[PDB]
Amino acid sequence: NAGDSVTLNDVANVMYYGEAQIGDNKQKFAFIFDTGSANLWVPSAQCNTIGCKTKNLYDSNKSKTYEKDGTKVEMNYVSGTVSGFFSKDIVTIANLSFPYKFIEVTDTNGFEPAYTLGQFDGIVGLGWKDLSIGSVDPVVVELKNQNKIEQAVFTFYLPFDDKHKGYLTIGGIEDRFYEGQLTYEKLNHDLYWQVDLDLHFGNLTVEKATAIVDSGTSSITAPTEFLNKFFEGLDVVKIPFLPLYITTCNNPKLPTLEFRSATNVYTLEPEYYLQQIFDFGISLCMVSIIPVDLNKNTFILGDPFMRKYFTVFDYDNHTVGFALAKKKL
Template identity: 30%
Template structure:
């Protein structure tokens, strides 16, 4: 089991210029209490690495304390570099503007539009709403690079004000959800790359490693089989806005613990934990004999050896999450990664964040509107 100083919810599910469909646990300011941990965080170097298929672009991600996974992109001519969350729970790309007046921008890299010869300015105002915060600013366009992938005249947001991102270990967010949840009239970067012929297959995939800062990747245009075991199980999307699927049930020790009549689940790389309806999460914690500790639930660290796996049944396939994954050590106690707060969504909806995706290599297939899952190596 890895040891962490705190728990963080990342960028997470968003909907631009509309109300938030799912309420997340808490803001980054609240959850990143151990601010001194940010000082030792090193920037990752992003490269296109795959030698197997020239059409597969593999981009390195850096794991920040198993809470967030970031990669580098560049914007402009000459390129200005930023660390962003590659977020399946939103569709917009944004970074801080040099004109941003919020305290959060003072500790992050900012884009200077005056230093880019390829920048195109629209001044269209934008408002992007996240679970942990909001971004207000304007829309611009420029050359955006993800390693060797180049998106020309890519629309992106430039923040003038940011709320809830103080102390975040990333500068901005690169959304990978469907265009319908993004800023109206904007073609997201993945769609632009697809239209511009950057890859032959409109798929991307994530391998998120555990504990180590290095080794995680997002790949575009194909799948590298070295990152998973066995065969991919394909799951059709239940709707094509977020990466949403139907889930049959959640069980522990052979008993249904939640989702007894079926439910919905979102795979979200912008969220670190697993979120569900509060009353069902409370019931699951009772089965774990977990005790409430503020807004979180704690168990005896010795109990990790005896707790059962939590099993997510999706399309008839069991996806176990062992206690070593769903219990994390924080300071001198052990916390559950299950959190409530999705009551505003209908039907019953769960958010499966990075703690789930570390166990399962995940493929997001836009052509066929499906997700592939297989045990990660």
């Protein structure tokens, strides 16, 4: 149960990034690690677009272990659209080099404006394999298969705020990151890490909601209609044309969020979904609860929820685990 960690750098509580490497010469890139998708991708040396103009581009010419593939591919998100092509090379994460098949991205035009605004180069998928010929095993599964970790498991620890680092630990669950006992839940489908829940948000309930636990979303997200009802009488103001929700930091009306599994209960107090945004004359916060319409009743438990709950993702037992993150390491 010996773990292996990539340090995660926290920018303003909105995105967490870590470093990994590709190529025998070990080209460095910044990544979001995204439990929502399955591939590793990086912006290619031959990505022209404006977005790529600022990023670290992967150069195959300089890697003695590169191996052409050339298969064009296009994968999509909430985020949403991205295109390019498969390449094999040696990838290094935390300290483990392994041969992987990844995507060089040459088109990032439906990754705007998420991409340009961000200080990541590409994305490490920590999701589940596609049933397609021959999609790749996700990096953590591959590691297990190559016998480089003993368990196909990874955890997240995100620090309460700006002044401390976060951690993606691969291949072992480390006591240092939480208090009490992990609690575990069963998954319902295997596209991603999806959990069944009963939600109580202020006056609002939904029985049998499904929550994606997703490390690369910086908010709790919920269907528009339901979030519309959520905010009413809460004295939350939406900035027109922006996904931005502002309220007074000490708003006493703002409820503690409950999510109920079969046996368990997790709550999310205001303080974990509020980020101070302004401080002249009053303390003004953004609320990290935003509307995204996905499948029926589908909610995403992103960074705010994980800032409270250290979370374990076990491919091997098909479960997600939860416990109170330690306040200091």
